[PDB]
Symmetry: C3
Subunit: 195 residues, 3 copies
């Protein structure tokens, strides 16, 4: 069912300047936004109109947006989780409600990697890959077979440079951060379309 | 016998434009090229006129050339291998025929690390070093004592931040690849051998 | 702890790049630990007795950008992963520790003050482990005793499964053994003030 492809929209130049100005008037499209500070790149996934990514990529940094920089609405260092108001045009994934243990991690290179959930915030890859297959995909989505968000990719367990299992912030942890709330900008340099 | 030294030729700014334009009018020299996207760096080894490197660094990107960007001539994801037409000026290594297990790995820093081959695509360092010695040297060559290409550095077995063994695409897999068949990757430096 | 810290960014990537090329940094220098960068990677440097020390695996044999142009290395020790420059005017200097305490504190680029238990000449254990990301990019940062004196600089970490448990450092002694025995410039892009 689940397939994906990537689209690069900027170079490092556009990125650098966008970061400095915090002003991105490119058209936002897709559910998964390929994201970057000037010095490191990772993914940001959208759920419930909020654009979620990891703190170990974003920091407390703002998001470059059409009317200037967007301050983080949510920030949870303990859960390695931040979130901005999703910019106009960005599609939002719906949270999973079926309880499927068969998860699908989508990577920055638009690979769809099977995972079996074996814990609340953790699961094993059905076939190990070199860690390069995952690196730079933090803040990417884990999807159930219906393509609903179960959680966002946070870390991976590896040995001898081969990743055997993953760690993610579940979608429930987001609801808990959301309720509990109640120099450079991060830049959208591409996206990953789903289906 | 084997020795090697490095030469940088571009800054990151130079690299950024050369990447976007896709046009590199610099003089290509050496057998091993220090290569970079705008955002990561590794190596590319030339063998029999083909300029090889790793997919996990270069993706499916073109290579900035003196008459515009050059499209990958080979792309084997499963082996983590990509190849371009070697750009004019580059020198080319010849595959090893002597079957030696005494390999020698050349790094981006130009260190010549002795490796004992212990499998088709696998070998051990005679004395371990910190992973930082190797990191960024994917696409670099592993050389027999006579200075010929046996393979191409791909990944490393490390623990506690020290590298003990390596994994490399053998020069035969390249022959199999050859038989079967936004930004450009940029040459920002090179490594001269002897 | 009597020891607390915060960081100040002073440059961005474009600013860093130019300054690397020129090797001329006219920015006013402050604090003991300097956030340091080549164009393509970033780490830390610590001042002890007028000498600004960092890791070779970050700086190599690069000059340091200075107010009257680039500063050649005063000490280089690749066996120990150690390099040092004359501390540029403005830079405050920590003092070597003499109490022989084993209750060390690692300071990171994100201004975290991590407890460590010295368990060897040049090695220690984190009192409570953390994800490796907490340490990455903090090489050349200070390990301090309870009195805020230097015992050594952060060099490497022992990790498994993405969690850092122990660390490896150059002792301050080894620097005194270096002191007796003996294209781009590295650029300061921020600092970390201690107390
Ligand atoms: C308790 O739950 C967790 C659980 C985890 C926590 C945590 O995970 C960070 C993880 C640990 C480390 C890691 O997994 N390995 C070394 C193993 C090999 C690589 C595995 C491949 C991919 C991994 C997803 C990934 C990644 O792609 N990152 S990335 O995109 O490349 C990038 C650096 C942003 C550019 N994540 C990641 O690589 N890294 C950090 C922190 C926090 N860090 C900080 C600051 C100081 C950086 C604050 S919080 N917290 C946590 C909490
Ligand atoms: C079956 O044989 C192999 C066998 C291996 C395969 C594979 O190896 C990638 C390897 C696994 C990981 C790794 O070794 N460690 C974590 C251990 C610590 C570091 C050891 C130091 C240096 C290592 C050589 C090195 C390196 O220098 N890389 S690099 O230059 O710095 C750089 C990021 C590109 C800039 N290689 C590398 O670091 N990494 C990838 C893929 C493919 N990946 C993909 C995409 C999605 C990225 C497609 S194919 N395939 C494979 C196949
Ligand atoms: C004998 O004592 C030691 C002992 C160790 C030696 C050594 O260790 C460097 C260590 C080994 C490797 C490592 O620990 N891991 C992969 C594990 C996961 C990460 C742990 C997190 C943080 C670590 C502190 C740190 C760091 O933050 N680095 S950094 O800032 O990000 C950066 C790349 C510079 C930008 N250091 C570091 O990560 N790395 C290298 C060399 C030498 N290297 C060279 C050249 C060839 C590069 C010359 S010497 N020497 C040594 C000597
Ligand atoms: Cl390691
Ligand atoms: Cl800048
Ligand atoms: Cl923090
Ligand atoms: Cl990390
Ligand atoms: Zn579902
Ligand atoms: Zn030979
Ligand atoms: Zn003391």
């Amino acid at each position: 069912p689940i397939t994906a492809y990537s689209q690069q929209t900027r170079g490092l130049l556009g990125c650098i300047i966008t970061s400095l100005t915090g002003r991105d008037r490119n058209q936002v499209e897709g559910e998964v936004q390929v994201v970057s500070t000037a010095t490191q790149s990772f993914l940001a996934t959208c759920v419930n109109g909020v654009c979620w990514t990891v703190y170990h990529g974003a920091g407390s940094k703002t998001l470059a947006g059409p009317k200037g920089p967007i301050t983080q609405m949510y920030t949870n260092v303990d859960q390695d989780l931040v979130g901005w108001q999703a910019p106009p045009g960005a599609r939002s994934l719906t949270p999973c409600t079926c309880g499927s243990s068969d998860l699908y991690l989508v990577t920055r290179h638009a690979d769809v990697i099977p995972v079996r959930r074996r814990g609340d915030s953790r699961g094993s890859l059905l076939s190990p890959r070199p860690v390069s297959y995952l690196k730079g995909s933090s803040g990417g989505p884990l999807l159930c077979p219906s393509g609903h968000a179960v959680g966002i990719f946070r870390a991976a367990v590896c040995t001898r440079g081969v990743a055997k299992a993953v760690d993610f912030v579940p979608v429930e942890s987001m609801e808990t951060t959301m309720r509990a709330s109640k120099k450079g900008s991060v830049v959208i340099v591409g996206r990953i379309i789903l289906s």
